[PDB]
C-alpha cells in the first residue's frame, strides 16, 4: 500500500539469573504494524537465533519524515533472494520522502525485476548530501542548472461521448 516507516525494538524474554536481555532495533517499511512486527520477527530469526515464541516486542514507533517538503536524492541499497544466492543492488531515486522512495523502488522491482515484497529486502536508504555523489544519468539529468522542458502532444480527457470540434494537442 502506501508505505510507512517504523522502528521495532524487541528482545529475548528475560530468564532466571540472566536478566535484562539486550535490545535490538530495526527500521521496517510496511503498510501497518502487524506487517511490521511480522517482518521484524522474520529478519530477527534470519539474522540472530531468536524466535518469536522466545522473544517479545518492546516498542514500535512510526518515524515521520523530517523535511517532507524538501526534494532529495536517495541511494537505496537492497538485496533480493535468488536460486544462485543473495544479490546486491543499488538504485537512485529522486523524491521528497523515504517512504515514497521505497514505494517507487518496490514498483520498479515489480515492473523490471519481476520481484515481490517478501523477496525484496530494504538494506539501507541514505540521502545523497552532495550532488557530485549522484552517479546515475537518469537522476543526474534533472540536476542541471536552469532546467526547462516542454510537454508536447497534450491529450485532454473528454467527459462526453461526442465532440463537436476537432481536438488540439497544443500546450
Amino acid at each position: 500500500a502506501h508505505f510507512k516507516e517504523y522502528q521495532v525494538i524487541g528482545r529475548r524474554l528475560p530468564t532466571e539469573s540472566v536478566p535484562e536481555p539486550k535490545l535490538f532495533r530495526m527500521r521496517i517499511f510496511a503498510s501497518n504494524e502487524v506487517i511490521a512486527k511480522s517482518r521484524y520477527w522474520y529478519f530477527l530469526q534470519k539474522l540472530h537465533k531468536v524466535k518469536k515464541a522466545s522473544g517479545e516486542i518492546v516498542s514500535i514507533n512510526q518515524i515521520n519524515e523530517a523535511h517532507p517538503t524538501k526534494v532529495k536524492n536517495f541511494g537505496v541499497w537492497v538485496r533480493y533472494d535468488s536460486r544462485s544466492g543473495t544479490h546486491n543492488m543499488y538504485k537512485e531515486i529522486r523524491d521528497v520522502s523515504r517512504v515514497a522512495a521505497v514505494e517507487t523502488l518496490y514498483q520498479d522491482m515489480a515492473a523490471r525485476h519481476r520481484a515481490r515484497f517478501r523477496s525484496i529486502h530494504i538494506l539501507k536508504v541514505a540521502e545523497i548530501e552532495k550532488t557530485a555523489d549522484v552517479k546515475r544519468q537518469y537522476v543526474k539529468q534533472f540536476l542541471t542548472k536552469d532546467l526547462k522542458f516542454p510537454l508536447p502532444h497534450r491529450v485532454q480527457k473528454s467527459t462526453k461521448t461526442f465532440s463537436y470540434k476537432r481536438p488540439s494537442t497544443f500546450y
Binding site: Q137, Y138, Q141, F142, L147, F149, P150, P152
Partner: protein, 191 residues
C-alpha cells in the same frame, strides 16, 4: 534511457536561406532550390541566428535520436547541394563489343540509351530524373558525368545506370563489361 533533450546543429553559409514550417524544409542557394518533407519524424526546429539552426527531440529514445542525427545529415546534404552541387563520374568498359551510350528524347523525357552491351540486340533505356544533367566526358575515354543539386537523385540515377547492365549467367571473374561509378564529388572546384 529517455534523455530529457537531445539536439543537433546545422550551419548555414552566407548565400543560403532555409525556411522550415511544419517540417517542410526549403533550401535556397546560388544553384537553385530544394525541398524536403520530414513529417514522418517528430523533431523541433529552432533558429538562434541566421547562421545556426538547432533540431531537437524532447524525451526520446534510441530510434528517435538516431532519426534526429539522420535529419541533420539530410539538411546538411541539401545545403551542400544548393551551394556546391554533386557530380558523379562513371566509366563503361568492354572486352569485345563496344558499348554505345546516347541521350534520346521519347516525348521529351530524356532517356539514356545503351546499345551493344555484350553484343545484345536489346536496347536498354534509363530515364533521367528531374534535376540531373548527363554529359559525355571530354578527353576521357568512355566516361559519363551526372550532375545536379540533389545527391539522392544523382546517386539513384547512377545506380540505375549501373544496374541496367548486369551480366547474367556468366562468370564475373572473366566477364568484366559494365558501367561503374568511378568518382563522386562536387561540381564546384574553386580549390
Amino acid at each position: 534511457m529517455k534523455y530529457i533533450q537531445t539536439e543537433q546543429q546545422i550551419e548555414v553559409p552566407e548565400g543560403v536561406t532555409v525556411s522550415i514550417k511544419s517540417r517542410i524544409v526549403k533550401v535556397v542557394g546560388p544553384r537553385g532550390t530544394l525541398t524536403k518533407n520530414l513529417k514522418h519524424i517528430d523533431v523541433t526546429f529552432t533558429k538562434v541566428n541566421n547562421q545556426l539552426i538547432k533540431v531537437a527531440v524532447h524525451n526520446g529514445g534510441r530510434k528517435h535520436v538516431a532519426a534526429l542525427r539522420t535529419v541533420k545529415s539530410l539538411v546538411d546534404n541539401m545545403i551542400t547541394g544548393v551551394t556546391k552541387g554533386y557530380k558523379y563520374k562513371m566509366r563503361y568498359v568492354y572486352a569485345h563489343f563496344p558499348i554505345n551510350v546516347n541521350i534520346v528524347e521519347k516525348d521529351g523525357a530524356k532517356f539514356i540509351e545503351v546499345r551493344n552491351f555484350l553484343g545484345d540486340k536489346k536496347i536498354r533505356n534509363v530515364p533521367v530524373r528531374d534535376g540531373v544533367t548527363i554529359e559525355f566526358s571530354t578527353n576521357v575515354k568512355d566516361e559519363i558525368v551526372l550532375s545536379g543539386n540533389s545527391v539522392e537523385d544523382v546517386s539513384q540515377n547512377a545506380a540505375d545506370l549501373q544496374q541496367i547492365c548486369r551480366v547474367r549467367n556468366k562468370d564475373i571473374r572473366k566477364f568484366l563489361d559494365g558501367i561503374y561509378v568511378s568518382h563522386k564529388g562536387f561540381i564546384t572546384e574553386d580549390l
